[PDB]
Design a protein around this ligand. Structure first.
Ligand code: NA
Ligand code: NA
Ligand code: NA
Ligand code: NA
Length: 40
C-alpha cells in the first residue's frame, strides 16, 4: 500500500486504544480520534 504519512511524532489516541504517530496515521487507518496525545 502506498506510504502516505510522515514519521513526525505528534501522537494521537485512537478509539481502538492504539497510539497513532500523528493524525495522518489515524485518519488513514479509518479510526476515530479519542483524544490528542498518546493513549494512556
Ligand atoms: Na497491495
Ligand atoms: Na521519516
Ligand atoms: Na482495541
Ligand atoms: Na475522547
Amino acid at each position: 500500500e502506498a506510504a502516505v504519512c510522515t514519521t513526525e511524532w505528534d501522537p494521537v489516541c485512537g478509539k481502538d486504544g492504539k497510539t497513532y504517530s500523528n493524525l495522518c496515521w489515524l485518519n488513514e487507518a479509518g479510526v476515530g480520534l479519542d483524544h490528542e496525545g498518546e493513549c494512556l
